[PDB]
Design a protein around this ligand. Structure first.
Ligand SMILES: Nc1ncnc2c1ncn2[C@@H]1O[C@H](COP(=O)(O)OP(=O)(O)OC[C@H]2O[C@H](O)[C@H](O)[C@@H]2O)[C@@H](O)[C@H]1O
Ligand SMILES: Oc1cc(O)c2cc(O)c(-c3ccc(O)c(O)c3)[o+]c2c1
Ligand SMILES: [Zn+2]
Length: 281
């Protein structure tokens, strides 16, 4: 909170004009269609349309802190509903168009959305997830785990164990979880397309994973209202609200954004569902 360096905060928003936005979302369609392995990278900007403020946007947690004001929540973590973006990603995984999802978000919404945990990396941890120090068994709770920085929560392990239970929320000095970073890095190196949604890309190594896709000729799309640390490296930069982008993409792809049934946890990806045939490009 003092020692922490918060990167650049409160940069100006960019809006693509509506005909450029429409053109660019068609090109995002064309690239999704051309690709064999698609990885999505999400940050705090996908949850802003759910009432959860971001870090470095105009009213982000850190931006407001810099000006001596508070960020504002229009929801609790528990009562937050996944966005259209969240549900678009669920569907794109179910019809096999997303190989893997890498998220810096600690907000719990991917997991509560129904997104399979074996295709998700939560680089910064999950506020609803506690982990046994002894067996490493993870517990997805209906309520936020009351501590941050990999501290004792008060709860014991209930396996076959009685290990001390601790939060998954990284402090500034904490190493990223080895499993999640290992898988996110592998998915990012093998992708032929990395699509960044609602991240400023300013945190290392989280914000560098999409760069790994450009090695051996992969393409990079950044969707973001503000500039991001790697705009220069993008084949396609879309300045728009992620909900409007992802709903036009899904319409181009012939997909519906499915219903949210309330909080549900899926450990393992299901077999792939049908998807529409590909346009000639
Ligand atoms: N609806 C929206 N549509 C598109 N862009 C949006 C929207 N709302 C916000 N944005 C943009 O979304 C971007 C979000 O960027 P940042 O606030 O840096 O969040 P992170 O996920 O990268 O933070 C990384 C970590 O840093 C922290 O310390 C924690 O550890 C976090 O895990 C901004 O550029 C907004 O313009
Ligand atoms: O004012 C606070 C105090 C806290 O202890 C927080 C802990 C958090 O994990 C978050 C949080 C903030 C913004 C997000 O976009 C997010 O995913 C979590 O906010 C706090 C705010
Ligand atoms: Zn245990």
């Amino acid at each position: 909170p003092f020692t922490a360096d918060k990167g650049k905060c409160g940069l100006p928003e960019i809006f693509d004009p509506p005909e450029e936005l429409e053109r660019k979302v068609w090109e995002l369609a064309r690239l999704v269609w051309q690709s064999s392995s698609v990885v999505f990278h999400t940050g705090a900007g996908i949850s802003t349309a759910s009432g959860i403020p971001d870090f470095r946007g105009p009213h982000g947690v850190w931006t407001m802190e810099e000006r001596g004001l508070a960020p504002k929540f229009d929801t609790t973590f528990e009562s937050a509903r996944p966005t259209q973006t969240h549900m678009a990603l669920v569907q794109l995984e179910r019809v096999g168009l997303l190989r893997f999802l890498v998220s810096q978000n600690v907000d719990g919404l991917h997991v509560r959305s129904g997104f399979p945990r074996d295709k998700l990396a939560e680089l910064h941890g999950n506020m609803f997830v506690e982990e046994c120090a002894k067996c490493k068994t993870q517990y997805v709770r209906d309520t936020v785990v009351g501590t941050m920085g990999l501290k004792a929560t008060g709860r014991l392990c209930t396996v076959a164990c009685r290990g001390e239970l601790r939060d998954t929320i990284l402090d500034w000095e904490d190493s990223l979880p080895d499993r999640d970073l290992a898988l996110a890095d592998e998915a990012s190196r093998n992708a032929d397309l990395s699509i960044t949604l609602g991240t400023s890309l300013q945190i290392r190594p989280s914000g560098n994973l999409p760069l790994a896709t450009k090695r051996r000729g992969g393409r990079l799309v950044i969707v973001n209202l503000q500039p991001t640390k790697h705009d220069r490296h993008a084949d396609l930069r879309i300045h728009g609200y992620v909900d409007e982008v992802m709903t036009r993409l899904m319409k181009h792809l012939g997909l519906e954004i499915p219903a949210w049934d309330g909080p549900r946890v899926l450990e393992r990806a299901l077999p792939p569902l049908p998807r529409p045939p590909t346009p000639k490009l």
